């Protein structure tokens, strides 16, 4: 499929950016996570980034570490994550769905088999957080064989060689990292680096989504204004889940309110 | 692209977030430059001799092998400043940190010997040191926590996960991914992403080079085997390296068997795990059927890690080195035996290597064999733990 | 009658009950014989090198003297097996015990480093070891109690008197006076009745011999002074001996000042006591006006003794060596300074010597001086005591 | 004076041995110690051995260590010991009185001055426990200048040279040690060594008193039967004091009974 390509063309025509929330699949349980995801979509999410729980998530700060832990406490497995993904796709046929994976979960029972499972449930992209472009060959090859976009990271201090590689190897979107460090809402990044955005466009890279530390509508607007195609917010969303565990109605109301405001900021 | 090979056969690599690649490339370039720099080599050699106390003794045991055809020597890394082999390569890495203009050090530690080494080198060479250590290890290796703090290092207990080495490793890497502009990650073992397995080997290989010279001097021939415990692989690869091309010399690595392999409470991924990607490397690891990383277990904090360095996985794969396991109880017996019959209190990690050598002797007591055990550290850090065990089991 | 001079000027002698004279004469004859025996000398040299790890490093400090005209080297007896200089002469005395057909060892200990040395040598050489230790020291030097017991030594707490070194010495001598037929008294310092001050010096003098060779190699000249703490006198006489005839080399011994000389809570008899007869010798001691032996005090258990070896009293009397005192607080500061700026955790005893060298530098910072401090032991035994102090005084 | 010489001549004429108790001066206080000593004499003691309390008594086992401690708890000093000695001598003009000293108490304010104080209060002998014959010159010289007998020890494994020295240097009595070790009642020694007794006589030594571990009348009889001139008992006597601290009447009754029985055994 061409779900990202279709989304970005629609957004370009409307002259707006994408807002893409991240959550951990199965946090705080399967049923509540499915409701959370439906609420994110209803409130205006253009695309989703969805984490599969992993025992040792090394690009993640405490907020998302604790989301992983809640999902495990609910007994969430990768198999159950694929069942969820199938159910999400069956309800929402056009929204791009990206997975945030750690390498061992992809490598585990065979890389090719992992990407084949992604294709069957209708996933659009996979970002493997601990596989740099230098180690990416078997991952990106399997992804393309199964019509999945392999997502690559453009860090703030990317040199020219890396920009060229990310532009050639990636598809769907390019992940524009706001800052060094791990995920977290309280650690706000730099203003999207114009030179990186401009070079990625010069090399015909997939459109850039800025992520890490984006927790406010002002940061979303700033990203689109700088020429990025949109922004991803994770920890800020997960904080609303964590805050409202005993109050599911209030959780969804606050999620809706935040997502709506973040989306409005993408308009931009 | 890299200057040196990041792989040992299938194992190794650089499986880190993209943000960290320039730091690893910078480290590799600095190492390659330093290895050709006579000034760097002279500075490192001076510290090893005049500050750390190298060469370390090679001690012939004369009571524990009585009545057998085993001759056993102990390579005395327990005599190194700090009390373990960890000090050798920390001195090299600290000099690399200074060469690269870094002013801060991050390290993980399990036994606290790498933490102690990192703290002492930082006090000497003027670096600001922060050390991550699992909360369980902070308790069971408490003497080393006190030593690190008296030397001015920040020690940060890690309560996440198993609250042991894996979890400290995780936190150290998370920290580095945000602080690499000013901080060097002084990884404490021959594992992790390239170039660490290579650098750590090259900065530990004096262990085997000295051993070879000393055994030639005393016996006029090479050992039949050299034996070392394997936590992440640094003391073992340090002993093995200079012997790899001496095809007659057996290389035996000893993983922790914990409560017994059959219990699943062990730290023996090389022989009982399966290949995975974690901690920046493709290596054998303890993992669930779904590919979650399992918690390891050992009585010894320095061995309590669910993976292993990639050069050991490679040496095993080609049959050049053999790997075995020793349980908590076998290690405790070897600890007691060395204390009482040789007057040397060994680290519990090193006790695993000794326990295997004692088994090689006891199983075949008329086999003529010349063995060297790498006595990687002293056991001062373990005396309160060992006391409490021997008391509870009523001795 | 004796083969060697029992006196150093007025000081020394053999002031023991008549029952013990044959044992002392036997010991002296055995020492004189051993000192001429190439086989004995080769055995002792082999143990020192291949078991204890000699020669020990001589480390140039490069941070603590910054901005002054002092060059300071540390003789690293902290690197010796066991963790202190005490191991050198215990290996010699154990070999003498075996030469005399003794199967058992009695020793006293304060810091527990002599106790640890006695226990390790006994485990190695097949002797049955019992160690007397004051109850206060059993608490404040607890790591060493654990080490001695794991090596199979019997450790007997002494609750009598001050429950410190003097009281342990008393009990060891009482025991020996009934057990000398089968037991060697492995006295732990250069004090007590002849021939112990002489034997202990001769079995510690490698410290200064190595120091001289190393300082000639590195600086092309002798030190301006060598500085050592004085508990009973063994590490100091070990450093001093080879320099006594080098008239240009200052010899500085450092007694514990405790809470301050003016408080009477100290261990500085050489400069603040008066000559008496106790522990088998005529030597300076802390005593009441009536001639009762006073209790000493020091933060450091190894210095907490109310007398001193007779060769130090003699060297002082003729002006060949100078003696000074350092208080608990000055020693604690030197401990902290070495940990934080050189990455070496020194014994609290050795910290007294370092504190004086730091004062020599700080008082006259433009005085050109080349100094060696004997770093007699490592401070692992002291870390819990130092922690509790620095916590209570709020750091 | 010639108090030992006179005593041994009287005992020889009566064909009996000496029984010589030891106590610590001032244990458990000055007044009670004086009463104890009067009781010892009244019950038959031929001579006395009296300890001056010392901080570190290294030839003494726990029983006598604890006697020293009781005297110190009562504030007993060497000066007070000399006052006691004067009072004992004033009551008892012929009984030989020997002191058990540690070297530092003699050496303290001058050796000569110590022996001069002994002469003035009427002490007959001084045994310095930690001064062997090899170190004895200034002690024995001062003792003889002040008409005090210096007492020397003949240990069980004395060689010929030592026997000759002890015979020449000593006066009053020769101390025949029963065994190695320190003082104590529970540790019983060997039967007095006949060869030592016989050699001491051959070399015209002062008469031998056997001591250390003599706690029973049978041991006293055995000593005299072996040819010793008598026996000394310390810890056995001190144990009666320690046992009866709260019962002074009972203390003296038991002391009298024990001393009488020990003396009877010397008859022999
Ligand atoms: C005396 C001694 N002997 C052997 C070992 C085993 O380590 P090896 O020689 O590297 O295999 C240790 C391990 N010590 C650790 C663990 N160090 C550690 C282990 C695994 C991953 C990261 C680490 O920092 C420490 O942090 O001190 C030790 O102290
Ligand atoms: C590291 C270190 N540094 C210096 C010293 C001071 O002792 P010195 O070098 O002999 O003057 C010690 C003293 N240690 C004692 C006391 N040893 C002791 C002291 C006095 C009388 C009898 C004894 O056995 C011990 O028993 O371990 C020490 O451990
Ligand atoms: O809003 P925050 O700060 O929580 O950041 C949310 C990011 N979630 S994610 O799936 O895009 C995401 C993307 C990349 C990550 O690691 C890598 F960069 F190393 F690849 C980790 C998470
Ligand atoms: O009956 P015991 O076992 O208590 O022995 C009593 C002895 N009391 S004493 O004054 O004669 C006495 C005599 C000699 C002593 O030491 C020396 F031999 F080293 F000189 C100590 C005490
Ligand atoms: Cl591949
Ligand atoms: Cl290669
Ligand atoms: Cl290779
Ligand atoms: Cl290749
Ligand atoms: Cl490959
Ligand atoms: Cl970067
Ligand atoms: Cl088992
Ligand atoms: Cl001389
Ligand atoms: Cl001399
Ligand atoms: Cl002379
Ligand atoms: Cl003299
Ligand atoms: Cl004898
Ligand atoms: Cl003061
Ligand atoms: Cl004299
Ligand atoms: Cs053997
Ligand atoms: Cs391991
Ligand atoms: Cs200097
Ligand atoms: Cs002293």
Place of tokens 């002084």: B186
Determine the Cα–Cα distance for residues D224 and D220; give it in Å rounded to an integer.
7
Collapsing DSSP to helix, strand or coil, A88 comes out as helix
Query: Does chain A reach chain D with at least 3 CB pairs under 8 Å?
Result: no
Determine the Cα–Cα distance for residues A24 and A100; give it in Å rounded to an integer.
9
Q: Which residues of B47-69 are buried (b: 16+ CB within 10 A; e: fewer)?
A: bbebbbbbbbbbbebeebbeebe
Q: Which domains does chain C have, with CATH numbers?
A: 8-52+86-204 (3.40.50.1100), 53-85+205-390 (3.40.50.1100)
Place of tokens 């015209």: D204
Q: Which two tokens stand for residue B391?
A: 């008391």
Q: Tell me whether residue A111 is exposed, middle or buried, using C-beta atoms within 10 angstroms of its C-beta: 0 to 12, 13 to 18, 19 or more.
A: middle
Describe the strand order of the beta sheet including C225-229 as a list of residue ranges.
C58-60, C70-76, C369-375, C225-229, C250-258, C322-327
Do residues A149 and A143 make contact, with C-beta atoms less than 8 angstroms apart? yes
For β-strands C7-8 and C11-15, DSSP reports them as antiparallel
Return the closest-CA partner of residue B132 out of B145, B146, B151, B150.
B145
Helix A111-121 and helix A78-91, axial crossing angle in degrees, nearest 10: 30
Contact D108 C15 (CB under 8 A): no
Residue B308 alpha carbon to ligand 3 centre in Å: 28
Do residues C162 and C295 make contact, with C-beta atoms less than 8 angstroms apart? yes
Describe the strand order of the beta sheet including B250-258 as a list of residue ranges.
B58-60, B70-76, B369-375, B225-229, B250-258, B322-327
Handedness of CA D159, D161, D163, D169 (dihedral sign): negative
Range of the domain at D3: 1-268
Determine the Cα–Cα distance for residues C391 and C27; give it in Å rounded to an integer.
48
Provide the CA D145 distance to its chain's centre, in angstroms: 21
Q: Which two tokens stand for residue A255?
A: 């999620």
Q: Which residues approach ligand 4 with their CB closer than 6 A?
A: C 17; D 22, 49, 59, 64, 100, 127, 129, 153, 175, 177, 183-185, 211-214, 232-236
- B182 to chain A, any CB pair closer than 8 A? The answer is no
Q: Which two tokens stand for residue C110?
A: 């304060």
Find the DSSP H helices in B283-382: 310-317, 328-342, 348-363
Q: Which residues approach ligand 3 with their CB closer than 6 A?
A: A 22, 49, 59, 64, 100, 127, 129, 153, 175, 177, 183-185, 211-214, 232-236; B 17
Closest by Cβ to C290, choosing from D77, D131, D180: D77
Resolution value in angstroms: 1.5
Provide the CA D146 distance to its chain's centre, in angstroms: 19
Residue count of chain B: 395
Do residues A267 and A51 make contact, with C-beta atoms less than 8 angstroms apart? no
Q: What are residue C375's DSSP bridge partners? A: C76
- Give, in order, the Cα–Cα distances in Å from A77 to each of A52, A81, A87, B277: 8, 6, 16, 18
Return the closest-CA partner of residue A82 out of A54, A37, A52.
A52
Determine the Cα–Cα distance for residues C78 and B335; give it in Å rounded to an integer.
23
Return the closest-CA partner of residue C231 out of C134, C310, C303, C338.
C303
Determine the Cα–Cα distance for residues B296 and B285; give it in Å rounded to an integer.
10
Q: How many CB pairs under 8 A join A and B?
A: 90
Q: Tell me whether residue A202 is exposed, middle or buried, using C-beta atoms within 10 angstroms of its C-beta: 0 to 12, 13 to 18, 19 or more.
A: exposed
Supply the CATH number for residue A52's domain. 3.20.20.70
Q: Which two tokens stand for residue B179?
A: 């602080």
Experimental method: X-ray
Distance from CA of D264 to the nearest CA of C (A): 31
Place of tokens 């800025």: A210
Do residues B249 and B379 make contact, with C-beta atoms less than 8 angstroms apart? no
Active site residue B61: yes
- Give, in order, the Cα–Cα distances in Å from B218 to each of A160, B59, B63, B71: 58, 10, 18, 12
Determine the Cα–Cα distance for residues B197 and B199; give it in Å rounded to an integer.
6
Which residues, at least 6 apart from A134, have a Cβ–Cβ distance to it below 8 Å? B1, B14, B21
- Give, in order, the Cα–Cα distances in Å from B351 to each of A32, B256, B299, C81, C365: 51, 10, 11, 17, 49
Do residues B60 and C50 make contact, with C-beta atoms less than 8 angstroms apart? yes
- Give, in order, the Cα–Cα distances in Å from C246 to each of B149, B168, C72, C212: 42, 54, 19, 10
Determine the Cα–Cα distance for residues C171 and D58; give it in Å rounded to an integer.
8
Show contacts of C119-122: CB within 8 Å, 24+ apart: C119/B343, C119/C147, C119/C148, C119/C151, C119/C152, C119/C153, C120/B343, C120/B344, C120/C81, C120/C82, C120/C87, C120/C90, C120/C151, C121/B343, C121/C87, C121/C90, C121/C91, C121/C93, C121/C94, C122/B343, C122/C94, C122/C151, C122/C152, C122/C153
Handedness of CA C374, C377, C380, C382 (dihedral sign): negative
From the CA of B261, the nearest ligand is: 11
Q: What are residue D233's DSSP bridge partners? A: D21
Q: What are residue C325's DSSP bridge partners? A: C255
Return the closest-CA partner of residue B166 out of B324, B349, B18, B303.
B303
Task: Specify the DSSP class assigned to residue B291.
Answer: S
The per-type count for chain D, helices as H runs and strands as E runs, is 12, 9
Provide the CA D175 distance to its chain's centre, in angstroms: 9
DSSP, residue by residue, B139-208: HHTHHHHHHHHHTT-EEEEE-STTSSHHHHHHHHHHHHHHHTTTEEE---SS-SSTTHHHHHHHTTTHHH
Element (H, E) at B325: strand B322-327
Do residues B115 and C348 make contact, with C-beta atoms less than 8 angstroms apart? no
CA angle, residues D18, D23, D24, in degrees to nearest 5: 150
Collapsing DSSP to helix, strand or coil, C344 comes out as coil
Q: Which residues approach ligand 1 with their CB closer than 6 A?
A: B 84, 86, 108-115, 165, 169, 188-189, 191, 229-236, 302-303, 305, 347, 349-350, 376-377
Determine the Cα–Cα distance for residues B138 and D145; give it in Å rounded to an integer.
72
- A177 to chain B, any CB pair closer than 8 A? The answer is yes
Number of domains in chain D: 1
Find the DSSP H helices in chain C: 21-35, 38-46, 86-99, 113-125, 135-140, 142-150, 165-179, 196-202, 206-219, 234-240, 269-272, 310-317, 328-342, 348-363, 383-392
Do residues A226 and A190 make contact, with C-beta atoms less than 8 angstroms apart? no
Active site residue D186: no
Which residues, at least 6 apart from B363, have a Cβ–Cβ distance to it below 8 Å? none
Return the closest-CA partner of residue C130 out of C115, C140, C145.
C115
Do residues D192 and D138 make contact, with C-beta atoms less than 8 angstroms apart? no
The protein residue with its alpha carbon nearest to ligand 3, atom 14, reads: A129
Determine the Cα–Cα distance for residues C220 and C56; give it in Å rounded to an integer.
19
What is the position in ligand 1's atom list of the atom closest to the CA of B235? 9
Find the DSSP H helices in chain A: 3-13, 30-42, 62-73, 78-91, 103-107, 111-121, 137-145, 160-169, 194-202, 217-225, 235-243, 248-265
* Cβ atoms < 10 Å from Cβ of C391: 9
C interface test, pick of B84, B150, B384 with most C CB neighbours within 10 Å = B150
Q: What are residue A231's DSSP bridge partners? A: A19, A210
Do residues C374 and C56 make contact, with C-beta atoms less than 8 angstroms apart? no
Task: Specify the DSSP class assigned to residue B132.
Answer: E
Residue count of chain C: 395
Do residues D162 and D154 make contact, with C-beta atoms less than 8 angstroms apart? yes
Place of tokens 């215990």: C90
């Amino acid at each position: 499929m061409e779900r990202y390509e279709n989304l970005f063309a629609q957004l370009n025509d409307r002259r707006e950016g994408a807002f893409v929330p991240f959550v951990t699949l199965g946090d705080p349980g399967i049923e509540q996570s499915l409701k959370i995801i439906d609420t994110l979509i209803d409130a205006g999410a253009d695309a989703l980034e969805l984490g599969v729980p992993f025992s040792d998530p090394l690009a993640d700060g405490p907020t998302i570490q604790n989301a992983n832990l809640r999902a495990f406490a609910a007994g969430v497995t990768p198999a159950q994550c694929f069942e969820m993904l199938a159910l999400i796709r069956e309800k929402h046929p056009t929204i791009p769905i990206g997975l945030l994976m750690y390498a061992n979960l992809v490598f585990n029972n065979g890389i090719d088999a992992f990407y084949a499972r992604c294709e069957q449930v209708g996933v659009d992209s996979v970002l493997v957080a601990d596989v740099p472009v230098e180690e990416s060959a078997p991952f990106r090859q399997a992804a393309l064989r199964h019509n999945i976009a392999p997502i690559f990271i453009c860090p703030p201090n990317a040199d020219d060689d890396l920009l060229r590689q990310v532009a050639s190897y990636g598809r769907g979107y390019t992940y524009l990292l706001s800052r060094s460090g791990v995920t977290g809402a309280e650690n706000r990044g730099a203003l999207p680096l114009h030179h990186l955005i401009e070079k990625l466009k010069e090399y015909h890279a997939a459109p850039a989504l800025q992520g890490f530390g984006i927790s406010s509508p002002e940061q979303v607007s700033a990203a689109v204004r700088a020429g990025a195609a949109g922004a991803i917010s994770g920890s800020a969303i997960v904080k609303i889940i964590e805050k409202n565990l005993a109050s599911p109605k209030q959780m969804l109301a606050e999620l809706r309110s935040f997502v709506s405001a973040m989306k409005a900021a993408s308009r931009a | 692209t890299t200057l040196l090979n990041p792989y040992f056969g299938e194992f190794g690599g650089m499986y880190v977030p993209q943000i960290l690649m320039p730091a690893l490339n910078q480290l590799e370039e600095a190492f390659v430059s330093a290895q050709k720099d006579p000034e760097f080599q002279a500075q490192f050699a001076d510290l090893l001799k005049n500050y750390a106390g190298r060469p370390t003794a090679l001690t012939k045991c004369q009571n524990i092998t009585a009545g057998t055809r085993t001759t056993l020597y102990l390579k005395r890394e327990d005599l190194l400043h700090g009390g373990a082999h960890k000090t050798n390569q920390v001195l090299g890495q600290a000099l690399l940190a200074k060469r690269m203009g870094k002013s801060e050090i991050i390290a993980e530690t399990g036994a606290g010997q790498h933490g102690v080494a990192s703290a002492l080198a930082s006090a000497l060479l003027g670096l600001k040191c922060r050390i991550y250590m699992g909360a369980k290890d902070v308790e069971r290796q408490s003497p080393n926590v006190f030593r690190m703090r008296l030397m001015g290092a920040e020690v940060i207990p890690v309560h996440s996960g198993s609250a042991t080495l894996k979890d400290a490793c995780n936190e150290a890497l998370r920290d580095w991914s945000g602080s690499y502009e000013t901080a060097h990650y002084m990884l404490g073992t021959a594992a992790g992403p390239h170039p660490y397995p290579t650098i750590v080997r090259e900065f530990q290989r004096m262990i085997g080079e000295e051993t070879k010279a000393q055994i030639l001097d005393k016996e006029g021939r090479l050992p039949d085997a050299v034996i070392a415990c394997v936590g992440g692989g640094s003391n073992a690869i340090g002993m093995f390296a200079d012997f790899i091309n001496d095809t007659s010399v057996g290389l035996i690595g000893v993983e922790p068997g914990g409560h017994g392999i059959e219990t699943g409470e062990h730290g023996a991924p090389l022989k009982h795990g399966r290949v995975g990607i974690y901690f920046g490397m493709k290596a054998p690891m303890m993992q669930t059927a779904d590919g979650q990383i399992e918690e390891s277990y050992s009585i010894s904090a320095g061995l309590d890690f669910p993976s292993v360095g990639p050069q050991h996985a490679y040496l095993n794969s080609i049959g050049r080195a053999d790997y075995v396991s020793i349980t908590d109880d076998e290690a405790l017996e070897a600890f007691k035996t060395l204390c009482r019959h040789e007057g040397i209190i060994p680290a519990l990690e090193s006790s695993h290597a000794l326990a295997h050598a004692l088994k090689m002797m006891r199983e075949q007591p008329e086999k003529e064999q010349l063995l060297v055990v790498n006595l990687s550290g002293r056991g001062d850090k373990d005396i309160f733990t060992v006391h409490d065990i021997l008391k509870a089991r009523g001795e």
